[PDB]
């Protein structure tokens, strides 16, 4: 595995046939394995696209790897999903696992469906970043933090309080899977495409105010598109 | 001298680390008086000086293959180490070769006259 060396203002592959001493490895603290947010590559953040990026496969056992400090994530995910028979789906995170240190909008999902596979797997092989351990598998509970890792040779309340958008799942692990945003014990908004967590946040203008606000024992499910809100379009 | 990722690259790395230089008080040092676990994290934002970040994203992209292939070859569950081994091979490739002056090694100083 090659490492990028920072030298002469550029990255260079470490896997060369000469170890030129223009760079000195004075200590092990010049070593880096920093995580990077997958999102920083222009990768889509749609909740359905996230599903589209996971393999949903039974398979060779999961591994995680230790990695170095790195960038904040705007979007990450938490999962409660189970099989249609209520069986647990995806292993619970292993001891000492916690969600990534700085996702600003951790999305969360609940509900059930076939939830195919055992470890899911990232289709691009991108690592889930739980805390400081990169992963090949999706863990229940803790934040997914999709990302990639680079190895290189070196020469306030919102930091955890930020986090938005929780939703139900209808089915799981398939293209037919659907998700619905939930606020104020109301389930609405398929999250079909192009909706930032902030796009969804402004829709709390509807809570007990601009439309919505059922006068009945419970929620009616409006479709995301008043046109967006799909007020009174629940069925 | 390597090529930048062909993905669009976000140059602003608002980032966090567990690094925290110094220890103003020993209480910070004591686990009993230590910060909430997330408090170890500290933060700042990188700017893409010298174009390094977009190249870094490509480095990571290429690394997802090199690394994962290696990870498949590993037998450890949580693969806590790697870079240490890389430092070992740095030294192994730097040392035990023949080396007076003529060989391309040992960072030889100019001769005294």
């Amino acid at each position, epitope marked *: 595995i090659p490492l990028g060396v920072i030298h002469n203002s550029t990255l260079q592959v470490s896997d060369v046939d000469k170890l030129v001493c223009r760079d000195k490895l004075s200590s092990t603290n010049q070593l880096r394995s920093v995580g990077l947010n997958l999102e920083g590559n222009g990768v889509a953040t749609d909740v359905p696209s996230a599903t589209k990026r996971w393999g949903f496969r039974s398979g060779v056992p999961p591994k995680v790897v230790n990695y170095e400090a790195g960038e904040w994530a705007e979007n990450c995910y938490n999962l409660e999903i189970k099989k249609p028979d209520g069986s647990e789906c995806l292993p619970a995170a292993p001891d000492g696992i916690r969600g990534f240190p700085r996702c600003r909008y951790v999305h969360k999902v609940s509900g059930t469906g076939p939830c195919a596979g055992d470890f899911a797997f990232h289709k691009e092989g991108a690592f889930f970043l739980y805390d400081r351990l990169a992963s090949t598998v999706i863990y229940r509970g803790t934040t997914f933090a999709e990302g990639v890792v680079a190895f290189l040779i070196l020469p306030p309340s919102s930091g955890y309080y930020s986090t938005t958008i929780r939703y139900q799942a209808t089915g799981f692990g398939t293209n037919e899977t659907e998700y619905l945003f939930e606020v104020d014990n109301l389930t609405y908004v398929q999250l079909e495409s192009r909706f930032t967590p902030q796009f969804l946040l402004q829709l709390n203008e509807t809570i007990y105010t601009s439309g919505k606000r059922s006068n009945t024992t419970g929620k009616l499910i409006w479709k995301v598109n008043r046109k967006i809100r799909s007020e009174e379009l629940s069925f | 001298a*390597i090529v930048n990722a062909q993905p669009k690259c976000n140059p602003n790395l608002h980032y966090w680390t567990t690094q925290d230089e110094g220890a103003a008080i020993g209480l910070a040092w004591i686990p009993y008086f230590g910060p909430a676990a997330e408090g170890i994290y500290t933060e700042g934002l990188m*700017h893409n000086q010298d174009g390094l970040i*977009c190249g870094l994203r490509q480095l990571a992209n290429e690394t997802t293959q090199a690394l994962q292939l290696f990870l498949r070859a590993t037998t450890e569950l949580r693969t806590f180490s790697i870079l240490n081994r890389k430092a070992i091979d740095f030294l192994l490739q730097r040392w035990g070769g023949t080396c007076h002056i003529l060989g391309p090694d040992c960072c030889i100083e100019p001769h005294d006259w």
Partner: antibody, heavy 118, light 107 residues
Framework: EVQLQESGPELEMPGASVKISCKAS????????MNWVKQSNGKSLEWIGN????????TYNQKFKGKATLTVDKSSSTAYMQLKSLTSEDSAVYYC????????????WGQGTLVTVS | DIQMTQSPASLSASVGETVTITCRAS??????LAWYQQKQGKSPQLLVY???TLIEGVPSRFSGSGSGTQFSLKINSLQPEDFGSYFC?????????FGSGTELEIK
């Protein structure tokens, strides 16, 4: 989408300083660390500087002598620049526009404001 | 600081005529390059980034090219909305030096 709102162009007395400001039209500016650029006399652009949108730390073009005051006010969705020791030769379109290192992000200022002196 | 230039200082063309603009940088920066366009009285819009690629919504007529110290922009079948000022830019850290500028003219 972010737009960088600013007041129309204005006449100034010599030796004037002007605190230029722009208010973003939306939330994406918070991670932008926006750039400043200039077109004196309609001439090709000079990079001016940038301001971190979380910390307000700044950098500026070292050929932009006497720099500019540079501040940010994330709570106001706004960022600032201050012109110094102005003369008529400094008339320029002053941009709050953001020149991203890459297309993953971008912002720009269409207001067309120009500061002039006499 | 990296120095940058552009030529021809202007380029007259008939509508539907393919045109090219070329530019240079004092040092090879491994394609941290960009291009911009504006109408008179209008702010520049990013056209190109990373040397060879286009900002979304830029028409297929445009083509980034080159790397490092030498790069160019081509517009196939140039259209009346495209006549304007052009710029180049350095993204290899800061300051973000710009090209000397060019402008299209109508035949």
């Amino acid at each position: 989408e972010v737009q960088l709102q600013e007041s129309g162009p204005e006449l100034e007395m010599p030796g004037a300083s002007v605190k230029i400001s722009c208010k973003a039209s939306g939330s994406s500016f918070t991670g932008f660390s926006m750039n400043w650029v200039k077109q004196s006399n309609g001439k090709s652009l000079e990079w001016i500087g940038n301001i971190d949108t979380y910390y307000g730390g700044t950098t500026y073009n070292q050929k932009f002598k006497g720099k500019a005051t540079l501040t940010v006010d994330k709570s106001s969705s706004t960022a600032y620049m201050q012109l110094k020791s102005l003369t008529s030769e400094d008339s320029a379109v002053y941009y709050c526009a953001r020149s991203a290192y890459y297309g993953s992000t971008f912002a720009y200022w269409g207001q067309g404001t120009l500061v002039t002196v006499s | 600081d990296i120095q940058m230039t552009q030529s021809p200082a202007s380029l007259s063309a008939s509508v539907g005529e393919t045109v090219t603009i070329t530019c240079r940088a004092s040092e090879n920066i491994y394609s941290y390059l960009a291009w911009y366009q504006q109408k008179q009285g209008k702010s520049p819009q990013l056209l190109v980034y990373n040397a060879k690629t286009l900002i979304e919504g830029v028409p297929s007529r445009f083509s980034g090219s080159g790397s490092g110290t030498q790069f160019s922009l081509k517009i196939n079948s140039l259209q009346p909305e495209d006549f304007g000022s052009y710029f180049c830019q350095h993204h290899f850290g800061t300051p973000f030096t710009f090209g000397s500028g060019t402008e299209l003219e109508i035949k």
